[PDB]
Amino acid sequence: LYFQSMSLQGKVALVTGASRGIGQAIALELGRLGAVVIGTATSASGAEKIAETLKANGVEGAGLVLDVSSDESVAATLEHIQQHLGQPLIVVNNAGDDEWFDVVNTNLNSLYRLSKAVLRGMTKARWGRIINIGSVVGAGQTNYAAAKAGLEGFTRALAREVGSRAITVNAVAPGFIDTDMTRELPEAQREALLGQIPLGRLGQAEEIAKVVGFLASDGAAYVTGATVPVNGGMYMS
Amino acid sequence: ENLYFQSMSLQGKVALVTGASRGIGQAIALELGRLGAVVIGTATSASGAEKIAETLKANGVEGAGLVLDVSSDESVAATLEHIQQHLGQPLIVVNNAMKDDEWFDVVNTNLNSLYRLSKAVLRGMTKARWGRIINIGSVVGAGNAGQTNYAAAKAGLEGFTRALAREVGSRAITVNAVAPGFIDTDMTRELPEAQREALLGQIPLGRLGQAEEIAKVVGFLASDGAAYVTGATVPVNGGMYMS
Amino acid sequence: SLQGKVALVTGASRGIGQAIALELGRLGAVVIGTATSASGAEKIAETLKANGVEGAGLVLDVSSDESVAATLEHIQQHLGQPLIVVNNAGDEWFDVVNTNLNSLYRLSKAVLRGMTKARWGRIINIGSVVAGQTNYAAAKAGLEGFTRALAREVGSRAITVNAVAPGFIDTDMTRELPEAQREALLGQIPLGRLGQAEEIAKVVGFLASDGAAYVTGATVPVNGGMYMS
Amino acid sequence: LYFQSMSLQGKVALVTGASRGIGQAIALELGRLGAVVIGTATSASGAEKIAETLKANGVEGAGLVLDVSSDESVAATLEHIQQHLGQPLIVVNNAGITRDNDEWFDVVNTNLNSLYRLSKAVLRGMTKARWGRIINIGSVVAGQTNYAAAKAGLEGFTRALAREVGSRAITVNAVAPGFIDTDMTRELPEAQREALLGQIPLGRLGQAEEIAKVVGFLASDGAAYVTGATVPVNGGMYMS
Ligand SMILES: COc1cc(NC(=O)c2cccc3cccnc23)c(OC)cc1Cl
Ligand SMILES: COc1cc(NC(=O)c2cccc3cccnc23)c(OC)cc1Cl
């Protein structure tokens, strides 16, 4: 009957960058699995759009504004969530060439800032899921490889730090996924990229979201420090 | 009236699980049965086969237990034919079947058997334009000798899984692996406890994994939701990484 | 022969850094070794002298833009541009890695101008020697990825960027470890011993040579066969 | 008498597949470092060419016939070397087959089985001596699948063997080349050659000599604490 190792009934989930594509698909997948979902965006229109998308899909929750680069915004948002809905025990971080260093540095510093803030709730509860979403393939190769290596190593370290508390930390590393950014790449670049994917097609956003939905379940309780590649067989290093 | 047009489930899929008579294999066979697959579990002896049939029955899983020796082309071909005749083509296949100088033989044998089984099942999956091959790594099984063997089997399995994934991807067949850590099984239950505390101290979750926790990961990789996951090795080790 | 090259080695006052400074000097380089205190700088100058190596000991703090820029200027004025640079100087697990990578970047970017002008260079990053496991694995993963990314950025200029990842090496920190910990560690090392500082230095000496000109973005593990992920 | 001040004076080195390109460049590097070098080929003409090349370069040694897929040929060749020159304590495996000789699997399977066979046969001499160097050469860059597979197999194998023989002061390492300038690669059309270079941060092909230098180092006493490693030599081009 129940597919109970898959229920997120009774959990509150925070998904950053939820207004489109992968973030949005994740927010819906978690809602469908029975979570209350808070999706975030950096603008008020993104927040409002998120709330509408959740509504249209029968997902209870909210859309709110959050800037992951700001301690103040982070602390305030978490307070607001606490007051109105409870503590988020599932957090999905989806909010991301002499910039190559600064980009990775900035993204890992924001993962850390959001993660550390949410850990206190998860520690009290003795339960938690942190899931970090890598960037979609789309100079570019250097940045992509660097961000992916930083994310894997970061995810594994943080997993080690918080594991005694029954909190898992994992990542998902997408490949070429069909989104707004990728639909408008020049054809040459899109056809070259397809030619390197053994499945011979782009991934759907829903196919990232499924993986996230699994990692957030009780069935993935012994998986931690892992980076799961979701790339149709195309591995870029 | 016996017709059944499934959507996004394993309902009606036929799944073959090697080494299904105990522990991880058995937990996988039941998980796939619970997800609605018809399950053929295999063992190398007739008593194992019979035990698998009984376990499936007791749990309300439709399917069968059969004898299969993954090191033999004949046994493989025969077993596949029998499954075709009686149940249909298996489109989900799960391959689950003392010093530091045993590593070579062991890994060589296991990879050659993965290849042999995989190649035989690919024809059915190609015709159907759909498939799931899931390879299960071995559990940690001892200091040094054990570490060498484990790391070697794991490195071979990852590289092999990725290469096969590449070869069959164009056919909407995924190939993935699961790399367990320290799982609570027959071997681990009887370890000296003095040692057991040393082991736990290397695992961030501070416990052994359950066989069911490997089975859940396999259940997910077999689903439609995991369609864009291929060539991956998913570690299920509670955060303990040994290479 | 590194005859005619100027080599900067950070953290050169003892152990691995010192053995590297001597190995490069033995290969004919002029060597600037650095330390964070004036006594370290002076000790370096004395070690170099006692071994017949031309060069200098200076004070440098790799976490400060000012100290970096100043030191490089001083080297330029007095000796020329360093075209071989060996970086051996170094809640908490995050801040440690973050700080060390921000220092590698800071030093590296500052020395790249000299190397670009010369169309030749060698940057070699030294990892740290073996809770402890987490820190070690994290610093190692960060170093590998960073070394590879930088390699990519500067490769067109015939500059190589590589790292060396030591295992259990006989130094000041490891000499005083409790026996239990030392015997546990040995049991995991296939060569059944600690490495010598000179064994890291030799790897660095090879990476600095013309023979290693096609090696870039690599992390070479020097650990007697003991791998931790 | 004439004693080289190089890293391998007094050592005997066996290099398989020494009759051209990378294997030949290794044989000459090890000879230039003072080793006595036995280079091997599968045919008598290859063996003879190797002997001529070594002579022309002032390298003491020999060219012999060896088939790494045959236990008999292996044992025989090793015995001949012992009798006539001494035990090879440096062994470089460069006699990898390719898809030319289902295939992706058989290639890697065959090559790892030959590495194991040669390695196990030379380990007795190295154990007696309490010293050794085994160095495996990966293949140079469908093609991506084969290349990544051969590389992953070689890396895991090298590390496992390193573990098995380490207590004996024997090191086992590999070298993983990228795009190297060889007979095959010079002739490529411009379009294909410029595309290739654009994927290599150094912006050029490697020379065979540049692989040979890395092997030379790993064979020395200075690399005594390096074992189980795969050293990539690819100008910054990484594929997996
Ligand atoms: C892959 O290339 C990079 C990697 C890292 N950092 C890490 O990989 C990393 C890995 C593991 C822990 C970290 C903690 C703080 C910062 N970084 C890390 C990095 O640090 C920001 C910068 C670059 Cl360019
Ligand atoms: C990457 O793909 C492969 C890898 C291997 N083997 C290994 O990866 C391997 C890795 C480590 C130890 C081994 C011992 C015996 C045979 N193989 C191994 C392999 O074995 C023949 C076949 C393929 Cl396709």
The DSSP code sequence of D64-79 is: EE--TT-HHHHHHHHH
Handedness of CA D121, D122, D123, D129 (dihedral sign): positive
d(CA D127, CA D124): 5
Neighbouring residues of D239: CB distance < 8 A, sequence distance ≥ 6 = A237, D141, D144, D147, D148
Identify any residues that bridge with C123 across adjacent strands, giving them in sequence order.
C85, C161
Contact A40, A50 (CB under 8 A): yes
Phi/psi of residue D14, nearest 5 degrees:
-105, 125
C-alpha atoms less than 13 angstroms from C-alpha of C111 in its C-beta half-sphere: 31
Measured CA to CA in angstroms, residue B51 lies from A86, B43, B95, C5 at distances of: 48, 9, 19, 74
- Measured on CA atoms in the order B34, B39, B43, B49, is the torsion positive or negative? positive
For residue A198, give both structure tokens.
């053994």
Give the whole-angstrom CA distance, residue B147 versus residue B151.
Answer: 6
Residue carrying structure tokens 């990232």 = A208
Cβ atoms of A157 and C134 within 8 Å: the answer is: yes
Enumerate the residues of chain D whose CB falls inside 8 A of the CB of residue A145: 238
DSSP string, B28-85: HHHHHHHTT-EEEEEESSHHHHHHHHHHHHHTT--EEEEE--TT-HHHHHHHHHHHHH
> In this structure, which amino acid lies at residue C204?
V
- CA gap C120, D62 in Å, rounded: 38
User: Which architecture characterizes domain C1-229 according to CATH?
Assistant: 3-Layer(aba) Sandwich (3.40)
Distance, C-alpha D35 to centroid of its chain: 15
Q: Do D238 and A237 touch (CB under 8 A)?
A: yes
Q: Which two tokens stand for residue A151?
A: 């994310």
- DSSP H helices in chain C: 15-26, 38-50, 65-78, 92-118, 132-154, 172-175, 179-186, 197-207
Helices (H), chain D: 21-32, 44-56, 71-84, 103-129, 143-165, 190-197, 208-218
Q: Cα–Cα distance between C178 and D208 in angstroms, integer?
A: 47
C-alpha span between C219 and C162 (Å, rounded): 6
Q: Which among B162, B228, B231 has the least Cβ separation from residue A207?
A: B228
DSSP state of C169: B
Residue whose token pair is 């390695």: D119
Three-class secondary structure of residue C6 per DSSP: strand
Of C146, C157, C229, which to mutate for an interface test with A (greatest number of A Cβ within 10 Å)?
C146
Instruction: Read off the amino acid at residue D18.
Output: A
- SS3 call for A52: helix
Task: Determine the Cα–Cα distance for residues D69 and D95; give it in Å rounded to an integer.
Answer: 10
Any idea how long chain A is?
A: 237
- β-sheet bridge partners, residue C106: none
Half-sphere exposure of D41 (CA within 13 A, CB side): 19
Residue in A103, B73, A19, A101 with CA at minimum distance from that of residue C150: A101
Chain D contact present for C195, CB below 8 A: yes
CA separation for the pair C85, C34 (Å, rounded):
11
What is the rounded distance in angstroms from the CA atom of residue C186 to the CA atom of residue C194?
7
- Please tell me the distance from the alpha carbon of residue A77 to that of residue A14, in angstroms, as a whole number: 10
Type of residue at C36: T
Please tell me the total number of residues recorded for chain D in this structure. 240
Chain C CB contacts of D231 below 8 Å:
215, 218, 220
Structure-token pair, residue A45: 């229109």
- Distances in Å between the Cα of A88 and the Cα atoms of A34, A75, A125, A192, C162 are 14, 13, 10, 41, 42
| Chain B: touching chains (3 or more CB pairs < 8 Å) | A, C, D
- How far is residue D110's CA from residue D101's CA, in Å, rounded to a whole number? 10
Give bridge partners of residue B134 from the DSSP assignment.
B94, B176
Of D145, D152, D155, the CB nearest to B167: D145
Instruction: Judge: D223–C202 Cβ closer than 8 Å, yes or no.
Output: yes
Q: State how far the alpha carbon of D83 is from the alpha carbons of C1, D1, D40, D87, D122, in Å.
A: 38, 22, 17, 8, 14
- Residue B156 CA to ligand 2 center (angstroms) comes to 4
CA distance D209 to A25: 52
H-type helices in A57-186, by residue range? 71-84, 100-125, 140-162, 180-183
Residue position matching structure tokens 């320290």? B182
Task: Give the distance between the most distant pair of CA atoms in chain B.
Answer: 59
Q: Which of C149, C219, D144 is nearest to A141 (CA)?
A: C149
Cβ < 6 A, ligand 2 pocket: B 104, 107-108, 111, 152, 155-156, 159-160, 163; D 105, 108-109, 112, 149, 152-153, 156-157, 160
Tell me, in angstroms, the distance from the centre of ligand 2 to residue D43's CA.
28
The span from the first CA to the last CA of chain C, in angstroms, equals: 36
Q: Which residues contact D49 (CB under 8 A, 6 or more apart)?
A: D19, D41, D63
* B134/B10 Cα distance (integer angstroms): 15
Find the angle CA(B137)-CA(A30)-CA(B226) to the nearest 5 degrees.
35
Residues from chain A that touch C149, judged by Cβ atoms under 8 A, are 100-101, 104, 142, 145-146, 149
d(CA A117, CA A110): 11
Largest CA distance in chain C: 52
- Residue C209 and residue C121: Cα distance in Å, rounded? 10
D107 is written with which tokens? 């290639």
Domain boundaries, chain A: 1-237
CA of C110 to the centre of ligand 1 (A): 20
How far apart are the C-alpha atoms of C143 and C146, rounded to whole Å? 5
Total residue count of chain C as it appears in this document: 229
Neighbours of D45 (CB within 10 A): 12
C227 closest CB neighbour out of B143, B144, B243: B243
| Secondary-structure class of domain A1-237 per CATH | alpha beta
Contact predicate D54/D30, CB 8 Å: no
Return d(Cα D134, Cα D226) in angstroms, integer: 11
**Contact partners of C by the rule of 3+ C-beta pairs under 8 A?**
A, B, D
Helix axes C92-118, C132-154, angle to 10 degrees: 20
Give the distance (Å) from ligand 1 centre to CA of residue C141.
Answer: 8
Q: How far is D235 from chain A (nearest CA, A)?
A: 14
Any bridge partners for residue C195, and if so which? C169
The reply to whether residue D202 touches residue C156, judged by beta carbons under 8 angstroms, is yes
C180 secondary structure, DSSP code:
H
**Cα distances (angstroms) measured from residue D130 to each of C226, D123, D134, D165:** 20, 10, 13, 10
Distance from C-alpha of D62 to C-alpha of B10, rounded to nearest angstrom: 64
Cα–Cα dist B139/A98, whole Å: 44
Contact status of C105 with chain B (Cβ, < 8 Å): no
Q: What gap in Å lies between CA C44 and CA A98, rounded to an integer?
A: 35
Amino acid type, B198: A
Q: Do C203 and D224 touch (CB under 8 A)?
A: no
* Residue B46, min C-alpha distance to chain A (Å): 32
B102: its two tokens: 């045993």
> Number of Cβ pairs closer than 8 Å across C and D?
107
- List of chain B residues whose C-beta atoms are within 8 Å of the C-beta of residue C227: 151, 243
Residue that the structure tokens 């056809």 belong to: A191
Residues 6 or more apart in contact with residue B203 via CB below 8 angstroms: A163, B181, B182, B237, B238, B239, B240
According to the annotation, is B154 in a ligand binding site? yes
Instruction: Match domain B1-243 to its CATH number in 3.30.390.50, 3.40.640.10, 3.40.50.720, 3.40.50.2000.
Output: 3.40.50.720
Asked if B40 contacts B63 with a C-beta cutoff of 8 angstroms, the reply is yes
Distance, CA of A209 to chain centre:
9
CA distance D31 to chain C (A): 16
Helix (H, G, I), strand (E, B) or coil at D199: coil
- The reply to whether B32 touches chain A by the CB within 8 Å rule is no
Cα–chain-centroid distance for residue B91? 14
* CB contact at 8 A, B25 and B184: no
Interface test with chain B among A212, A222, A227, by most B beta carbons within 10 Å: A222
Tokens (6 digits) for C110? 């500052």
Which ranges in D171-224 belong to alpha helices (H)?
190-197, 208-218
* Spatial strand order in the sheet of D36-41: D61-65, D36-41, D12-15, D90-93, D132-137, D170-177, D230-233
What top-level class would CATH report for the domain D1-240? alpha beta
Cα separations in angstroms, A66 against A14, A103, D120, D174: 11, 19, 61, 49
Asked if residue B150 belongs to a known ligand binding site, the reply is yes
| Helices A21-32 and A44-56: angle between axes, nearest 10 degrees | 40
CB A21, CB A180: distance < 8 Å: yes
CB D127 within 8 A of CB D86: no
Resolution of the experimentally solved model in angstroms: 2.2
D145 near B CB under 8 A: yes
- Kindly report the number of other CB atoms within 10 A of residue C99's CB atom: 13
| Chain B nearest-CA residue for A211 | B226
Contact by Cβ (8 Å): C122, C158: no
- Tokens for B94? 């799960």
C117 C-alpha to ligand 1 centroid (Å): 29
**D88: alpha, beta or left, given left = phi > 0 and alpha = psi -120 to 50?**
beta
Is the Cβ–Cβ distance between A152 and C141 less than 8 Å? Answer: yes
Cα distance between residue B103 and residue D161, in whole Å: 9
Pair of tokens at residue B225: 């939701």
Question: CA of C107, closest CA in chain D: separation in Å?
Answer: 21
Burial class (CB in 10 A: 0-12, 13-18, 19+), B195: exposed
Nearest CA in chain C to B241: C229
The residues facing C87 across adjacent strands are: C125
Q: Which of A145, A150, A161 sits opposite C134 (nearest CB)?
A: A161
For residue B7, report the phi and psi dihedrals to the nearest 5 degrees. Answer: -130, 125
Distance from Cα D135 to the centre of ligand 2, integer Å: 17
What distance in Å separates the CA atoms of residue C71 and residue D29, rounded to the nearest whole number? 40
Q: Which two tokens stand for residue B114?
A: 């993965």
Cα–Cα distance between C7 and C27 in angstroms, integer?
11
| Residues of D catalogued as catalytic | 147
Q: Which residue's structure tokens are 């006539």?
A: D84
Report d(CA B76, CA B88) in Å as an integer: 16
Assigned token pair, B41: 């579990």
Site of tokens 């899921």: A129
- Give yes or no for C228 touching D (CB within 8 A): no
Cβ-proximal residues to C54 (8 Å cutoff; 6+ apart), any chain = C25, C30, C31, C48
H helix or E strand, kind and range, residue C85: strand C84-87
Q: Which among B215, B180, B184, B236 has a CA at the least distance from the CA of B26?
A: B215
Which residues have CB under 8 Å from D92's CB, separation 6+? D13, D14, D15, D16, D23, D26, D30, D135, D136, D137, D215, D219
How many Å is the Cα radius of gyration of chain B? Answer: 18
Q: Is the dihedral of CA A84, A86, A87, A91 positive or negative?
A: negative
Cα–Cα distance measured from residue B30 to residue B215, given in angstroms and rounded to the nearest whole number: 8
H/E stretch holding C155 reads none
Q: What gap in Å lies between CA B121 and CA D180, rounded to an integer?
A: 39
Name the residue at shortest CA distance from atom 9 of ligand 2: B156
Q: Which whole-number Å values give the CA distances from D82 to A57, D28, D79, in the listed order?
A: 78, 21, 5
The closest of A162, A168, A158, A160 to A221, measured between CA atoms, is A168
| Interstrand relation of D12-15 and D36-41 (parallel, antiparallel or unpaired) | parallel
Closest CA to D38 of D96, D73, D86, D97: D86
Name residue, tokens 């996924």: A177
Q: Which of C187, C188, C229 sits opposite B241 (nearest CB)?
A: C229
3-state secondary structure of A38: strand
Distance from CA of C154 to the nearest CA of A (A): 10
Instruction: Give residue numbers after which chain D breaks (C–N above 2.5 Å).
Output: 101, 141
Rg (alpha carbons) of chain D, rounded to whole number: 17
Angle between helix A100-125 and A140-162 (nearest 10) = 20
3-class secondary-structure state, position C97: helix
DSSP label at residue C171:
S
Cα B35 to chain centroid distance, Å, stands at 16
The residue among C15, C24, C12 whose CA lies nearest residue C194 is C15
A139 inside 8 A of chain D by CB: no
